[PDB]
Amino acid sequence: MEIDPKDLTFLKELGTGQFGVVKYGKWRGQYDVAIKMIKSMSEDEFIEEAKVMMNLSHEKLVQLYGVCTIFIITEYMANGCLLNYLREFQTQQLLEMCKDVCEAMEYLESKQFLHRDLAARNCLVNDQGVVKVSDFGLSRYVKFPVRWSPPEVLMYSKFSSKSDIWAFGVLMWEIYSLGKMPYERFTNSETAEHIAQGLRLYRPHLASEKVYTIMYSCWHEKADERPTFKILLSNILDVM
Amino acid sequence: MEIDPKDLTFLKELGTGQFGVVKYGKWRGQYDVAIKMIKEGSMSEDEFIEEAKVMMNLSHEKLVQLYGVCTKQRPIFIITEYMANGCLLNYLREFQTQQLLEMCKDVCEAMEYLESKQFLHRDLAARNCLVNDQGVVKVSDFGLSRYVLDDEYTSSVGSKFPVRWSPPEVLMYSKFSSKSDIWAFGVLMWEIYSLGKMPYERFTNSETAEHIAQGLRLYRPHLASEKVYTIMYSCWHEKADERPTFKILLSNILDVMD
Ligand SMILES: CC(C)(O)c1ccc2c(c1)[nH]c1c(C(N)=O)ccc(-c3cccc(-n4cnc5ccccc5c4=O)c3F)c12
Ligand SMILES: CC(C)(O)c1ccc2c(c1)[nH]c1c(C(N)=O)ccc(-c3cccc(-n4cnc5ccccc5c4=O)c3F)c12
């Protein structure tokens, strides 16, 4: 659980996010790790949920290795952000990326754990091109995420497994559009108002009819009519 | 430099550019503004934000004024002076020869100012010039192309690169200078005097570079007199050093009007 900082080396800077800088390093002189040096956070509240997060273990989830309490030590993902990877592929590889994320989300759904900010910017890519979900449940300890939010979140702040489903459909669109920003011609407030009245993302060029039916199923105005991640995974597996 | 988005209203869409949708709006409930949304992923934002400090201080009556930026949330916005007659190219296509020379003068005065501040436009063309309610032409989006992430816009061989407004040193070597803006200005004068024809119509982007490499140039528009053509043609010298400066061009334009 607790890692001693004397067992970490702080090498190349990888990038900057909401909580600060993330660096590449070595743990115990041998393992590649990403060290999130938190500047910005309700730390006491995070430290209590970190045990629950340590126990979330799935091959398509970026693994938390430990904490320095502050630093969050995680699995190193050599191809960085999915959004960067998509902007810098065969249709079969794009569906595999959706599958990877869906498997991670079906696991979080099975553990009653909400991501709360699912988007391609929170997905990472390893040296083998496997996509994994990162920063799950971290936003609770902190306008642009309006573009990944269903109407019940925008109007009522009602977060559930069905609000992560909506975000997942937008993520599938981000994958199939090769990293376009969703709702390119609308501001954050306009997105919010226009999706509540029926605006949905268009079908990307690279998405087949069956692929669009799966992402579109995520955007039902009624949360109860949206599928679950078990159903989405099954549908993705049937298409490939 | 920072504008709180609570002080902006985002009204009609004007069009779409390289970075995204441009909207008309109001600032502090009273001032007309253009709000240029920068789609996330389309710009090198950190480098733009540092040059915005320099762009705030570029102030001239024939330059579309930068009023501020909204960078605390994505997508970021660039707030500028509102130009009610929109694009010069649209204005030309929808005039006495004296008014055409006055439009060249307006642009030349803005460019003489950017030249005096060592600031390169990098994408001068009638599509980047705007027209206000009084018919005054102003230069917009100066220095913004340096922050575009799409290589199709940025490389001299790219499909969206402005080859038709570029001198040979830009096309061959990516050498931008005050003299590459001078070349673009001559093409802009031709766009004005031809009433908004696309330069080198019936030439693809790569056939245009070859035409330039053979020492060929845009023909004289029939609305252009001999003296007007000598001014635009002076901008297209194969040698950058032999091209005039904007002070000289302005002086020549002022002499032709007299
Ligand atoms: C070596 C490489 C490929 O340059 C790279 C780059 C970043 C990272 C990287 C490798 N590996 C990780 C890991 C990890 N666990 O290994 C965790 C977080 C980050 C990371 C940290 C901050 C910001 C982003 N970030 C966020 N949004 C973006 C939207 C568009 C384009 C890039 C980014 C973009 O790098 C990050 F990805 C990175
Ligand atoms: C109300 C009116 C006259 O319809 C109008 C229209 C556009 C604009 C406008 C007013 N005012 C501005 C301002 C500003 N600062 O006020 C800045 C940018 C744009 C603008 C934004 C995107 C694309 C173009 N654009 C680009 N190239 C063209 C080639 C041919 C014909 C039209 C266009 C053509 O509108 C734009 F002009 C506009």
Coordinates of C-alpha atoms and ligand atoms in Angstrom, one line a residue:
Chain A
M1 CA 0.0 0.0 0.0
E2 CA 2.5 2.7 1.3
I3 CA 5.6 3.1 -0.9
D4 CA 8.7 4.8 0.5
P5 CA 9.9 7.7 -1.8
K6 CA 13.5 6.4 -1.2
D7 CA 12.4 3.4 -3.4
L8 CA 11.4 5.8 -6.3
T9 CA 13.7 7.6 -8.9
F10 CA 12.1 10.6 -10.5
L11 CA 13.1 10.7 -14.2
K12 CA 11.4 12.2 -17.4
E13 CA 8.4 14.5 -17.0
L14 CA 5.5 13.0 -18.9
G15 CA 2.9 15.7 -18.7
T16 CA 0.6 18.0 -16.6
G17 CA -3.0 17.4 -15.6
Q18 CA -5.6 18.6 -13.0
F19 CA -3.6 17.5 -10.0
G20 CA -0.1 18.4 -11.3
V21 CA 2.9 16.8 -13.0
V22 CA 3.3 13.1 -13.8
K23 CA 6.8 11.7 -14.2
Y24 CA 8.3 8.5 -15.4
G25 CA 10.6 6.6 -13.0
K26 CA 11.8 3.3 -11.5
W27 CA 10.3 1.7 -8.4
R28 CA 12.6 -0.5 -6.3
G29 CA 15.3 0.0 -9.0
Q30 CA 13.5 -2.3 -11.5
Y31 CA 9.9 -1.5 -12.4
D32 CA 8.7 1.2 -14.7
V33 CA 6.2 3.5 -13.0
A34 CA 4.3 6.7 -13.5
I35 CA 4.5 9.0 -10.4
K36 CA 1.6 11.5 -10.1
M37 CA 3.0 14.3 -7.9
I38 CA -0.3 15.8 -6.6
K39 CA 0.0 19.7 -6.0
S40 CA -5.6 20.7 -5.6
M41 CA -7.0 17.6 -3.9
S42 CA -9.1 16.7 -0.8
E43 CA -6.2 14.5 0.3
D44 CA -7.7 12.9 3.5
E45 CA -10.8 11.9 1.5
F46 CA -8.6 10.5 -1.3
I47 CA -6.4 8.5 1.1
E48 CA -9.4 6.6 2.5
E49 CA -10.8 5.7 -0.9
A50 CA -7.2 4.7 -2.1
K51 CA -7.5 1.3 -0.3
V52 CA -10.7 0.6 -2.3
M53 CA -8.9 1.7 -5.5
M54 CA -5.8 -0.4 -4.7
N55 CA -8.1 -3.5 -4.9
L56 CA -9.6 -2.6 -8.3
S57 CA -7.4 -4.9 -10.4
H58 CA -8.2 -5.7 -14.0
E59 CA -6.0 -6.0 -17.1
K60 CA -7.7 -3.0 -18.9
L61 CA -7.5 -0.7 -15.8
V62 CA -4.3 1.3 -15.2
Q63 CA -3.1 -0.4 -11.9
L64 CA -2.4 1.7 -8.8
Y65 CA 0.8 0.2 -7.3
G66 CA 0.8 2.4 -4.1
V67 CA 0.9 5.8 -2.6
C68 CA 3.4 8.1 -0.8
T69 CA 1.5 10.0 1.9
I70 CA 1.5 13.3 -1.8
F71 CA 2.3 10.8 -4.7
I72 CA 0.1 8.2 -6.5
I73 CA 2.4 5.4 -8.1
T74 CA 0.9 3.6 -11.1
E75 CA 1.5 1.3 -13.9
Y76 CA 3.5 3.0 -16.7
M77 CA 1.8 3.3 -20.1
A78 CA 4.5 4.0 -22.7
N79 CA 2.2 5.3 -25.5
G80 CA 0.6 7.9 -23.1
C81 CA -2.9 9.3 -23.7
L82 CA -5.4 7.6 -26.0
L83 CA -6.4 10.9 -27.5
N84 CA -2.7 11.6 -28.5
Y85 CA -2.4 8.0 -29.8
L86 CA -5.5 8.4 -32.0
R87 CA -4.4 11.8 -33.4
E88 CA -0.8 10.5 -34.1
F89 CA -5.5 2.2 -37.7
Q90 CA -7.7 -0.5 -39.2
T91 CA -11.4 -0.5 -38.3
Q92 CA -10.8 -3.9 -36.4
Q93 CA -8.2 -2.1 -34.2
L94 CA -10.6 0.7 -33.4
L95 CA -13.3 -1.9 -32.2
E96 CA -10.5 -3.6 -30.1
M97 CA -9.8 -0.3 -28.4
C98 CA -13.6 0.0 -27.6
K99 CA -13.6 -3.6 -26.3
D100 CA -10.6 -2.8 -24.0
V101 CA -12.4 0.1 -22.4
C102 CA -15.7 -1.7 -22.2
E103 CA -14.0 -4.6 -20.4
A104 CA -12.5 -2.2 -17.8
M105 CA -15.9 -0.5 -17.4
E106 CA -17.8 -3.8 -17.1
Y107 CA -15.4 -4.6 -14.3
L108 CA -15.9 -1.2 -12.5
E109 CA -19.7 -1.7 -13.0
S110 CA -19.4 -5.2 -11.4
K111 CA -17.6 -3.6 -8.3
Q112 CA -20.2 -0.7 -8.1
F113 CA -17.4 1.8 -8.7
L114 CA -18.2 4.8 -10.9
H115 CA -15.5 6.3 -13.1
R116 CA -17.3 9.8 -13.1
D117 CA -15.0 11.3 -15.9
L118 CA -14.7 8.7 -18.6
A119 CA -13.3 10.2 -21.8
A120 CA -10.4 9.4 -24.2
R121 CA -8.2 11.9 -22.4
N122 CA -8.5 9.6 -19.3
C123 CA -7.5 6.4 -21.2
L124 CA -3.8 5.4 -21.6
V125 CA -2.0 3.2 -24.2
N126 CA 0.8 0.7 -23.4
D127 CA 3.7 -0.3 -25.6
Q128 CA 1.6 -3.1 -27.1
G129 CA -1.2 -0.7 -28.1
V130 CA -3.6 -2.0 -25.4
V131 CA -5.9 0.7 -24.1
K132 CA -6.6 1.0 -20.4
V133 CA -8.8 3.2 -18.3
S134 CA -7.1 5.5 -15.8
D135 CA -8.1 8.1 -13.1
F136 CA -11.3 6.2 -12.2
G137 CA -13.2 7.9 -9.4
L138 CA -10.5 10.6 -8.9
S139 CA -12.7 13.6 -10.0
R140 CA -14.6 13.4 -6.7
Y141 CA -11.5 14.8 -4.9
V142 CA -10.8 17.8 -7.2
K143 CA -17.3 22.7 -17.8
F144 CA -15.4 20.8 -20.6
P145 CA -16.7 17.3 -19.2
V146 CA -20.3 18.6 -20.2
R147 CA -19.5 16.9 -23.6
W148 CA -19.3 13.4 -21.9
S149 CA -22.4 14.0 -19.6
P150 CA -26.0 12.8 -19.9
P151 CA -29.0 15.1 -19.3
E152 CA -29.7 13.8 -15.8
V153 CA -26.1 14.8 -14.8
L154 CA -26.3 18.2 -16.5
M155 CA -29.7 19.0 -15.0
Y156 CA -29.8 17.1 -11.7
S157 CA -26.2 16.0 -10.9
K158 CA -27.5 12.4 -10.9
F159 CA -24.4 10.2 -11.4
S160 CA -24.8 6.4 -11.8
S161 CA -23.5 3.5 -13.9
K162 CA -25.8 4.9 -16.6
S163 CA -23.9 8.3 -16.7
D164 CA -20.7 6.3 -17.2
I165 CA -22.6 4.4 -20.1
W166 CA -23.3 7.8 -21.8
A167 CA -19.6 8.8 -21.5
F168 CA -18.6 5.5 -23.0
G169 CA -20.7 6.1 -26.1
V170 CA -19.0 9.5 -26.5
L171 CA -15.6 7.7 -26.0
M172 CA -16.5 5.2 -28.8
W173 CA -17.2 8.3 -31.0
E174 CA -13.8 9.8 -30.0
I175 CA -12.1 6.5 -31.0
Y176 CA -14.0 6.1 -34.4
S177 CA -13.5 9.9 -35.3
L178 CA -9.7 9.5 -34.5
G179 CA -9.8 11.9 -31.7
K180 CA -12.2 14.7 -32.7
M181 CA -13.5 16.9 -29.9
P182 CA -17.2 16.0 -29.5
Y183 CA -19.7 18.7 -30.6
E184 CA -17.1 20.8 -32.4
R185 CA -19.5 23.6 -33.3
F186 CA -21.0 24.1 -29.9
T187 CA -19.7 25.8 -26.7
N188 CA -19.9 23.9 -23.3
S189 CA -23.3 25.6 -22.4
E190 CA -24.7 25.1 -25.8
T191 CA -23.8 21.4 -25.7
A192 CA -25.6 21.1 -22.4
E193 CA -28.8 22.8 -23.7
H194 CA -28.8 21.2 -27.1
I195 CA -28.2 17.5 -26.0
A196 CA -31.2 17.9 -23.6
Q197 CA -33.3 18.8 -26.7
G198 CA -32.1 15.9 -29.0
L199 CA -28.7 16.8 -30.5
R200 CA -26.5 13.6 -30.9
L201 CA -23.1 13.0 -32.3
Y202 CA -23.1 12.1 -36.0
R203 CA -21.9 8.7 -37.2
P204 CA -18.1 8.7 -37.8
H205 CA -16.9 7.7 -41.3
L206 CA -15.0 4.7 -40.0
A207 CA -18.0 3.3 -37.9
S208 CA -20.3 0.7 -39.5
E209 CA -24.0 0.8 -38.9
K210 CA -23.8 -1.9 -36.1
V211 CA -21.0 0.1 -34.4
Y212 CA -23.1 3.3 -34.5
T213 CA -26.1 1.5 -33.1
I214 CA -23.9 0.5 -30.1
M215 CA -22.6 4.0 -29.4
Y216 CA -26.0 5.6 -30.1
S217 CA -27.6 3.1 -27.6
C218 CA -25.6 4.9 -24.8
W219 CA -27.2 8.2 -25.5
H220 CA -30.9 7.5 -24.7
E221 CA -32.6 10.5 -23.1
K222 CA -33.8 8.0 -20.3
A223 CA -31.1 6.4 -18.2
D224 CA -33.2 3.4 -17.6
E225 CA -33.4 2.7 -21.4
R226 CA -29.5 2.7 -21.8
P227 CA -27.7 -0.6 -21.8
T228 CA -25.3 -1.9 -19.1
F229 CA -21.6 -2.5 -19.8
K230 CA -22.3 -6.4 -19.8
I231 CA -24.7 -5.8 -22.7
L232 CA -22.4 -3.3 -24.5
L233 CA -19.4 -5.8 -24.2
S234 CA -21.6 -8.6 -25.5
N235 CA -22.7 -6.5 -28.4
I236 CA -19.1 -5.4 -29.2
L237 CA -18.0 -9.1 -29.0
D238 CA -20.8 -10.0 -31.5
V239 CA -19.8 -7.3 -34.0
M240 CA -16.0 -8.4 -34.0
Chain B
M1 CA -5.6 39.6 -21.1
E2 CA -8.0 37.1 -19.4
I3 CA -11.8 37.5 -20.1
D4 CA -14.2 35.8 -17.7
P5 CA -16.7 33.8 -19.8
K6 CA -19.5 35.0 -17.5
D7 CA -18.9 38.5 -19.2
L8 CA -19.6 37.1 -22.7
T9 CA -22.8 36.1 -24.5
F10 CA -22.3 33.7 -27.4
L11 CA -24.8 34.6 -30.2
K12 CA -24.9 33.8 -34.0
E13 CA -22.3 31.7 -35.8
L14 CA -20.3 33.6 -38.4
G15 CA -18.5 30.7 -39.9
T16 CA -15.8 28.1 -39.2
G17 CA -12.1 28.5 -39.6
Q18 CA -8.9 26.4 -39.0
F19 CA -9.4 26.3 -35.2
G20 CA -13.2 26.0 -35.1
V21 CA -16.4 27.9 -35.1
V22 CA -16.4 31.8 -34.9
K23 CA -19.4 33.4 -33.2
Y24 CA -20.7 37.0 -32.9
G25 CA -21.2 38.0 -29.2
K26 CA -21.3 40.7 -26.6
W27 CA -18.7 41.5 -24.0
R28 CA -19.6 43.1 -20.6
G29 CA -23.2 43.4 -22.0
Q30 CA -22.3 46.3 -24.3
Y31 CA -19.4 45.7 -26.8
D32 CA -19.7 43.7 -30.0
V33 CA -17.1 41.0 -30.3
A34 CA -16.1 38.0 -32.5
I35 CA -15.5 34.9 -30.3
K36 CA -13.2 32.3 -32.0
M37 CA -13.5 28.9 -30.4
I38 CA -10.3 26.9 -30.4
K39 CA -11.3 23.2 -30.7
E40 CA -9.4 21.1 -28.2
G41 CA -6.4 19.4 -30.0
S42 CA -6.2 21.9 -32.9
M43 CA -3.7 24.4 -31.4
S44 CA -0.4 24.3 -29.5
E45 CA -2.2 26.3 -26.7
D46 CA 0.7 26.9 -24.3
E47 CA 2.8 28.5 -27.0
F48 CA -0.2 30.5 -28.2
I49 CA -1.0 31.8 -24.7
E50 CA 2.6 33.2 -24.3
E51 CA 2.5 35.0 -27.7
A52 CA -1.0 36.3 -26.9
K53 CA 0.8 38.7 -24.5
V54 CA 2.6 40.3 -27.5
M55 CA -0.6 40.1 -29.7
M56 CA -2.6 42.1 -27.1
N57 CA -0.1 45.0 -27.6
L58 CA -0.5 45.0 -31.4
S59 CA -2.8 48.0 -31.8
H60 CA -3.5 49.8 -35.1
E61 CA -6.7 51.0 -36.8
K62 CA -6.3 48.6 -39.8
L63 CA -5.6 45.5 -37.6
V64 CA -8.5 43.5 -36.2
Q65 CA -8.0 44.2 -32.4
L66 CA -7.3 41.3 -30.0
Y67 CA -9.4 42.0 -26.9
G68 CA -8.5 39.0 -24.8
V69 CA -8.6 35.2 -24.3
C70 CA -10.6 32.7 -22.2
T71 CA -8.1 29.9 -21.2
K72 CA -9.4 28.6 -17.8
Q73 CA -11.6 26.0 -19.4
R74 CA -11.5 24.0 -22.7
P75 CA -12.2 24.8 -25.5
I76 CA -10.3 28.1 -25.1
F77 CA -11.6 31.3 -26.9
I78 CA -9.9 34.3 -28.6
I79 CA -12.0 37.4 -28.4
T80 CA -11.6 40.1 -31.1
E81 CA -13.1 43.2 -32.6
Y82 CA -16.3 42.6 -34.5
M83 CA -16.3 43.3 -38.3
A84 CA -19.9 43.5 -39.5
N85 CA -19.2 43.1 -43.3
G86 CA -17.2 39.9 -42.6
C87 CA -14.6 38.5 -45.1
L88 CA -13.0 40.7 -47.7
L89 CA -13.3 37.9 -50.2
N90 CA -17.1 37.8 -49.7
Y91 CA -17.3 41.6 -49.7
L92 CA -15.4 41.7 -53.1
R93 CA -17.6 39.0 -54.7
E94 CA -20.9 40.5 -53.4
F95 CA -16.6 49.1 -56.7
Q96 CA -14.8 52.0 -58.4
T97 CA -11.0 51.5 -59.1
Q98 CA -10.4 54.2 -56.5
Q99 CA -12.1 52.1 -53.8
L100 CA -10.0 49.1 -54.8
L101 CA -6.8 51.1 -54.3
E102 CA -8.1 52.3 -50.8
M103 CA -8.6 48.7 -49.8
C104 CA -5.0 48.0 -50.8
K105 CA -4.0 51.1 -48.7
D106 CA -5.9 49.9 -45.6
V107 CA -4.1 46.4 -45.7
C108 CA -0.7 48.1 -46.5
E109 CA -1.0 50.4 -43.4
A110 CA -1.7 47.3 -41.2
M111 CA 1.2 45.4 -42.6
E112 CA 3.5 48.4 -42.4
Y113 CA 2.6 48.4 -38.7
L114 CA 3.3 44.7 -38.2
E115 CA 6.6 45.1 -40.1
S116 CA 7.5 48.0 -37.7
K117 CA 6.9 45.6 -34.7
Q118 CA 8.9 42.7 -36.3
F119 CA 5.7 40.6 -36.3
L120 CA 5.0 38.3 -39.2
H121 CA 1.5 37.6 -40.4
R122 CA 2.5 34.2 -42.1
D123 CA -0.9 33.7 -43.9
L124 CA -1.9 37.1 -45.4
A125 CA -4.7 36.6 -48.0
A126 CA -8.1 38.2 -48.7
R127 CA -9.8 35.4 -46.8
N128 CA -7.9 36.7 -43.6
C129 CA -9.0 40.3 -44.1
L130 CA -12.2 41.5 -42.7
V131 CA -14.5 44.5 -43.5
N132 CA -16.3 46.7 -40.9
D133 CA -19.6 48.5 -41.2
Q134 CA -17.9 51.6 -42.8
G135 CA -16.2 49.5 -45.5
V136 CA -12.7 49.7 -43.9
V137 CA -10.6 46.7 -44.6
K138 CA -8.6 45.3 -41.7
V139 CA -6.1 42.5 -41.3
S140 CA -7.0 39.5 -39.0
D141 CA -5.5 36.2 -37.6
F142 CA -1.9 37.7 -37.8
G143 CA 0.7 35.1 -36.6
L144 CA -1.9 32.5 -35.7
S145 CA -0.9 29.8 -38.3
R146 CA 2.4 29.1 -36.3
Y147 CA 0.2 27.3 -33.6
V148 CA -1.9 25.0 -36.0
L149 CA -1.2 21.3 -35.1
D150 CA -2.5 19.9 -38.4
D151 CA 0.5 19.2 -40.6
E152 CA -1.7 19.5 -43.8
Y153 CA -1.9 23.2 -43.0
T154 CA 1.7 23.7 -41.7
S155 CA 4.0 21.9 -44.2
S156 CA 4.8 23.5 -47.6
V157 CA 3.8 20.2 -49.2
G158 CA 0.5 19.9 -47.2
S159 CA -2.9 19.9 -48.9
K160 CA -4.2 22.9 -47.0
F161 CA -1.0 24.9 -47.0
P162 CA -1.4 28.4 -48.6
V163 CA 0.9 27.7 -51.6
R164 CA -0.9 30.4 -53.8
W165 CA 0.2 33.2 -51.4
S166 CA 3.7 31.9 -50.8
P167 CA 7.1 33.0 -52.3
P168 CA 9.7 30.4 -53.5
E169 CA 11.8 30.6 -50.3
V170 CA 8.7 29.5 -48.2
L171 CA 7.7 26.8 -50.6
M172 CA 11.3 25.4 -50.9
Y173 CA 12.8 26.2 -47.5
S174 CA 10.1 27.3 -45.1
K175 CA 11.8 30.7 -44.8
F176 CA 9.3 33.1 -43.4
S177 CA 10.3 36.8 -43.2
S178 CA 8.8 40.3 -43.7
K179 CA 9.5 39.6 -47.4
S180 CA 7.2 36.5 -47.5
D181 CA 4.4 38.7 -46.1
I182 CA 5.3 41.2 -48.9
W183 CA 4.8 38.4 -51.6
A184 CA 1.4 37.5 -50.0
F185 CA 0.4 41.2 -50.1
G186 CA 1.0 41.4 -53.9
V187 CA -1.3 38.3 -54.3
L188 CA -3.8 40.0 -52.0
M189 CA -3.7 43.2 -54.3
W190 CA -4.4 40.8 -57.2
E191 CA -7.4 39.3 -55.3
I192 CA -8.7 42.8 -54.7
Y193 CA -8.2 44.0 -58.4
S194 CA -9.7 40.7 -59.8
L195 CA -12.7 41.1 -57.5
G196 CA -12.0 38.0 -55.6
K197 CA -10.8 35.5 -58.2
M198 CA -8.9 32.5 -56.7
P199 CA -5.2 33.0 -57.7
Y200 CA -3.8 30.6 -60.3
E201 CA -7.3 29.2 -61.1
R202 CA -7.0 26.0 -63.1
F203 CA -3.7 25.2 -61.4
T204 CA -3.5 22.7 -58.6
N205 CA -1.4 23.6 -55.5
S206 CA 1.7 21.7 -56.9
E207 CA 1.3 23.1 -60.5
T208 CA 1.3 26.7 -58.9
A209 CA 4.7 26.1 -57.2
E210 CA 6.1 24.9 -60.6
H211 CA 4.6 28.0 -62.3
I212 CA 6.4 30.2 -59.7
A213 CA 9.6 28.2 -60.1
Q214 CA 9.6 29.0 -63.9
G215 CA 9.5 32.7 -63.0
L216 CA 5.8 33.1 -64.0
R217 CA 3.3 35.2 -62.1
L218 CA -0.3 36.3 -61.9
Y219 CA -1.5 38.2 -64.9
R220 CA -2.4 41.9 -64.7
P221 CA -6.1 42.3 -63.7
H222 CA -7.9 44.5 -66.3
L223 CA -9.1 46.9 -63.5
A224 CA -5.4 47.4 -62.6
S225 CA -3.5 50.2 -64.3
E226 CA 0.2 49.8 -65.3
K227 CA 1.3 51.7 -62.1
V228 CA -0.9 49.4 -59.9
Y229 CA 0.5 46.3 -61.6
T230 CA 4.1 47.5 -61.1
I231 CA 3.3 47.8 -57.3
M232 CA 1.8 44.2 -57.0
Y233 CA 4.4 42.7 -59.4
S234 CA 7.2 44.3 -57.3
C235 CA 6.1 42.0 -54.4
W236 CA 6.8 38.9 -56.5
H237 CA 10.6 39.2 -57.1
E238 CA 12.3 35.8 -57.1
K239 CA 14.9 37.4 -54.6
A240 CA 13.4 38.4 -51.3
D241 CA 15.9 41.2 -50.8
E242 CA 14.8 42.9 -54.0
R243 CA 11.1 43.1 -52.8
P244 CA 10.0 46.4 -51.3
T245 CA 9.1 47.0 -47.7
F246 CA 5.6 47.9 -46.6
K247 CA 6.7 51.6 -46.1
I248 CA 7.8 51.7 -49.7
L249 CA 4.6 50.0 -51.0
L250 CA 2.5 52.4 -48.9
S251 CA 4.3 55.4 -50.4
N252 CA 3.9 54.0 -53.9
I253 CA 0.1 53.4 -53.3
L254 CA -0.2 56.9 -51.9
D255 CA 1.5 58.4 -55.0
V256 CA -0.8 56.4 -57.4
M257 CA -3.9 57.8 -55.6
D258 CA -2.6 61.4 -56.0
Ligands
LIG1 C1 5.9 9.3 -23.3 C2 4.6 9.9 -23.7 C3 4.0 9.2 -24.9 O1 4.8 11.2 -24.2 C4 3.6 10.0 -22.5 C5 2.9 11.1 -22.2 C6 2.0 11.2 -21.2 C7 1.8 10.1 -20.3 C8 2.5 9.0 -20.6 C9 3.4 8.9 -21.7 N1 2.2 8.0 -19.7 C10 1.3 8.5 -18.8 C11 0.7 7.9 -17.6 C12 1.1 6.6 -17.2 N2 0.4 6.0 -16.2 O2 2.1 6.1 -17.7 C13 -0.2 8.7 -16.9 C14 -0.5 10.0 -17.3 C15 0.1 10.6 -18.4 C16 -0.3 12.0 -18.7 C17 0.0 13.0 -17.8 C18 -0.4 14.3 -18.1 C19 -1.1 14.7 -19.2 C20 -1.5 13.6 -20.1 N3 -2.2 14.0 -21.3 C21 -3.6 14.3 -21.2 N4 -4.4 14.7 -22.1 C22 -3.8 14.7 -23.4 C23 -4.6 15.1 -24.5 C24 -4.1 15.1 -25.8 C25 -2.8 14.8 -26.0 C26 -1.9 14.5 -24.9 C27 -2.5 14.4 -23.6 C28 -1.6 14.0 -22.5 O3 -0.4 13.7 -22.6 C29 -1.0 12.3 -19.9 F1 -1.3 11.4 -20.8 C30 1.0 9.9 -19.1
LIG2 C1 -22.3 38.6 -40.8 C2 -21.3 38.2 -41.9 C3 -21.1 39.4 -42.8 O1 -21.9 37.2 -42.7 C4 -20.0 37.8 -41.3 C5 -19.4 36.5 -41.7 C6 -18.2 36.1 -41.2 C7 -17.5 36.9 -40.3 C8 -18.1 38.1 -39.9 C9 -19.3 38.5 -40.4 N1 -17.2 38.7 -39.0 C10 -16.1 37.9 -38.7 C11 -15.0 38.1 -37.9 C12 -15.0 39.3 -37.0 N2 -13.9 39.5 -36.3 O2 -16.0 40.0 -36.8 C13 -14.1 37.1 -37.8 C14 -14.2 36.0 -38.6 C15 -15.2 35.7 -39.5 C16 -15.3 34.5 -40.3 C17 -15.3 33.3 -39.6 C18 -15.2 32.1 -40.3 C19 -15.1 32.1 -41.7 C20 -15.1 33.3 -42.4 N3 -15.0 33.3 -43.8 C21 -13.8 32.9 -44.4 N4 -13.6 32.8 -45.7 C22 -14.6 33.2 -46.5 C23 -14.4 33.1 -47.9 C24 -15.4 33.5 -48.8 C25 -16.6 33.9 -48.3 C26 -16.9 34.0 -47.0 C27 -15.9 33.6 -46.1 C28 -16.1 33.7 -44.6 O3 -17.1 34.1 -44.1 C29 -15.2 34.5 -41.7 F1 -15.2 35.7 -42.3 C30 -16.3 36.7 -39.5

